[PDB]
């Protein structure tokens, strides 16, 4: 499985509630007091009032359709069989279900 | 941990139960990402075994 | 192989994401890895990175070239002048848009070194590497011959059959480059064609476009002030950890995946 | 940390040859182990990198056509943090105190 | 696998009993080479133990 | 030294072997290695390879 999480949603300077969704074991947290820092400075420049929208599921493994593990219910077994028979110099090769 | 830890009722089947004892932690201070924790593949688990 | 690169490259935007070891301290590094697979059986593995493969800096299929950016500055680099290793080093197979596929031996982690003309930076993950041998004789090497069994690897065909990954507007980045100190105010000069949302902290916070044209800033003299928002949206990104989500860019797109892993002998 | 004249240069690495006085950038010369290191800076006499575990260590110093490099027997201790044994630092996860060099001159 | 696999009668004596259970296996396809198996040197092994 | 040299490098005939891992999938390569002898106590290897030197 790949687990899937959303981009981060930051309400800087002010305050945000996660949005319930449906997703495979879908989980959504929300954080506050929180500071972002990026490449070109600090992203939030306000100390509190910084709430963290995170939202992770997971999703079925992209290789999943080539590789994967199967899962059958299995009972009530057929019998074949495949008979080379010569009777009265006839060399007869056939299957017969038992 | 354990075999059926993702569950499709086909491949091609969109829907699929999850039980992966998903949670998410404090992010660190300074980073923007998505800190998760959760059990390692079942699947993984027992193709190791 | 047209179809898939250009679907990938009309709404690609390379990034620069968040790196735990960038050679030096910690940074946000452009050769940021943010996803490594390593259940191929040879060894080989498929991950996806910030910088993207296959294509050059203008959209047209050069394979032979690793593309990616610096600051909000596209560039691109020949694929063979950048390697990746392990606890040995590895053999880079080829790169598809984020997607890369390279033959990388058993390792606890990842790390791939950008060597620029003077600065070279690079970026370590802290993910092993699976090298899982195919049987019931445990080889650490593969065996030069032998019988052959049914084998899963990653294959380097570039088609897409039954896996895509998500692609949305990517939401403002933060620019203080941008911000200029002027007399008794702040020169944020947006770049060319750019529209640079200026934040200002001060009495009266103001939030403006300026997008053609820099704006004098009273009252937020002071630099750190200011806090100036690049906003191009040129093309989709890819839903990515380091990135912000810009609540009002909702615009998923399917990204279908190359590399796919493949059965074989 | 500085030039051949005494000078404040925290880029070039400084030795000698016989007598003969060179320097040479930091980047150019680089150590490993059983995995390539990292340098952080280097300050005089010491100097401070990042190796991961090993059991040797070796700089290997490449000039325009001799490369010298000298390794020595001696083990690199990648003592973890606490009770969860991780060969690597992790991305993320709890913190707890941690004593590392760090790199000021003081 | 053990020692005297190879037995020779003078260190500069031609003549040598060879028995290394040494045999052959199919080329694999599109690729020249002696694909061959066998044991281990049993000196080897001896020096080992 | 001259002598063994030049005794070698009369009929040298460099070539190039197949070589399972070329760096990219399987191929033929002129740095091929057939031998690497091991028994070195200090850690030397004694090895030919296609290429001489
Ligand atoms: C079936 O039996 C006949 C007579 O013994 C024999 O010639 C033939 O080869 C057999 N077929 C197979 C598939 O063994
Ligand atoms: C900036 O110029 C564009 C033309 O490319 C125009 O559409 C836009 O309205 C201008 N912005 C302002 C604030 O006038």
């Given at each position: 499985?790949?687990?899937?999480?959303?981009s981060?949603?930051?309400?800087?300077?002010?305050?945000?509630?996660?949005?319930?969704?449906?997703?495979?074991?879908?989980?959504?947290?929300?954080?506050?007091?929180?500071?972002?820092?990026?490449?070109?400075?600090?992203?939030?420049?306000?100390?509190?009032?910084?709430?963290?929208?995170?939202?992770?599921?997971?999703?079925?493994s992209?290789?999943?359709?080539?590789?994967?593990?199967?899962?059958?219910?299995?009972?009530?077994?057929?019998?074949?069989?495949?008979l080379?028979?010569?009777?009265?110099?006839?060399?007869?090769?056939?299957?017969?279900?038992? | 941990?354990?075999?059926?830890?993702?569950?499709?009722?086909?491949?091609?089947?969109?829907?699929?139960?999850?039980?992966?004892?998903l949670?998410?932690?404090?992010?660190?201070?300074?980073?923007?990402?998505?800190?998760?924790?959760?059990?390692?593949?079942?699947?993984?688990?027992?193709?190791?075994? | 192989?047209?179809?898939?690169?250009?679907?990938?490259?009309?709404?690609?935007?390379?990034?620069?994401?968040?790196?735990?070891?960038?050679?030096?301290?910690?940074?946000?590094?452009?050769?940021?890895?943010?996803?490594?697979?390593?259940?191929?059986?040879?060894?080989?593995?498929?991950?996806?990175?910030?910088?993207?493969?296959?294509?050059?800096?203008?959209?047209?299929?050069?394979?032979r070239?690793?593309?990616?950016?610096?600051?909000?500055?596209?560039?691109?680099?020949?694929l063979?002048?950048?390697?990746?290793?392990?606890?040995?080093?590895?053999?880079?197979?080829?790169?598809?848009?984020?997607?890369?596929?390279?033959?990388?031996?058993?390792?606890?982690?990842?790390t791939?070194?950008?060597?620029?003309?003077?600065?070279?930076?690079?970026?370590?993950?802290?993910?092993?590497?699976?090298?899982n041998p195919?049987?019931?004789?445990?080889?650490?090497?593969?065996?030069?011959?032998?019988?052959?069994?049914?084998?899963?690897?990653?294959?380097?065909?570039?088609?897409?059959?039954?896996?895509?990954?998500?692609?949305?507007?990517?939401?403002?980045?933060?620019?203080?480059?941008?911000?200029?100190?002027?007399?008794?105010?702040?020169?944020?000069?947006?770049?060319?064609?750019?529209?640079?949302?200026?934040?200002?902290?001060?009495?009266?916070?103001?939030?403006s476009?300026?997008?053609?044209?820099?704006?004098?800033?009273?009252?937020?003299?002071?630099?750190?002030?200011?806090?100036?928002?690049?906003?191009?949206?040129?093309?989709?990104?890819?839903?990515?950890?380091?990135?912000?989500?810009?609540?009002?860019?909702?615009?998923?797109?399917?990204?279908?995946?190359?590399?796919?892993?493949?059965?074989?002998?």
């Amino acid at each position: 499985y790949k687990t899937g999480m959303d981009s981060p949603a930051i309400k800087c300077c002010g305050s945000q509630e996660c949005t319930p969704t449906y997703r495979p074991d879908e989980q959504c947290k929300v954080f506050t007091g929180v500071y972002p820092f990026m490449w070109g400075g600090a992203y939030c420049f306000c100390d509190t009032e910084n709430t963290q929208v995170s939202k992770a599921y997971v999703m079925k493994s992209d290789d999943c359709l080539a590789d994967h593990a199967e899962a059958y219910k299995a009972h009530t077994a057929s019998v074949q069989a495949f008979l080379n028979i010569t009777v009265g110099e006839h060399s007869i090769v056939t299957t017969v279900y038992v | 941990g354990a075999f059926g830890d993702i569950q499709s009722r086909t491949v091609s089947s969109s829907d699929l139960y999850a039980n992966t004892n998903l949670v998410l932690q404090r992010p660190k201070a300074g980073a923007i990402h998505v800190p998760y924790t959760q059990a390692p593949s079942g699947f993984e688990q027992w193709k190791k075994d | 192989s047209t179809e898939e690169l250009f679907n990938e490259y009309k709404l690609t935007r390379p990034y620069m994401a968040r790196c735990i070891r960038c050679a030096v301290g910690s940074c946000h590094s452009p050769i940021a890895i943010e996803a490594v697979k390593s259940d191929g059986h040879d060894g080989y593995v498929r991950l996806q990175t910030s910088s993207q493969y296959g294509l050059d800096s203008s959209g047209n299929l050069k394979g032979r070239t690793m593309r990616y950016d610096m600051h909000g500055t596209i560039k691109e680099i020949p694929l063979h002048q950048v390697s990746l290793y392990t606890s040995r080093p590895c053999h880079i197979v080829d790169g598809h848009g984020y997607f890369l596929l390279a033959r990388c031996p058993a390792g606890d982690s990842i790390t791939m070194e950008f060597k620029k003309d003077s600065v070279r930076h690079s970026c370590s993950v802290p993910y092993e590497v699976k090298f899982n041998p195919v049987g019931r004789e445990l080889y650490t090497h593969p065996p030069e011959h032998g019988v052959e069994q049914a084998c899963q690897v990653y294959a380097h065909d570039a088609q897409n059959r039954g896996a895509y990954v998500e692609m949305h507007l990517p939401g403002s980045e933060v620019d203080s480059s941008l911000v200029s100190l002027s007399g008794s105010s702040v020169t944020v000069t947006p770049p060319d064609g750019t529209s640079a949302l200026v934040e200002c902290e001060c009495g009266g916070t103001k939030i403006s476009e300026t997008i053609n044209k820099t704006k004098q800033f009273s009252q937020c003299t002071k630099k750190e002030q200011c806090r100036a928002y690049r906003l191009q949206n040129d093309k989709w990104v890819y839903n990515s950890d380091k990135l912000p989500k810009a609540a009002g860019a909702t615009l998923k797109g399917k990204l279908h995946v190359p590399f796919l892993l493949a059965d074989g002998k």
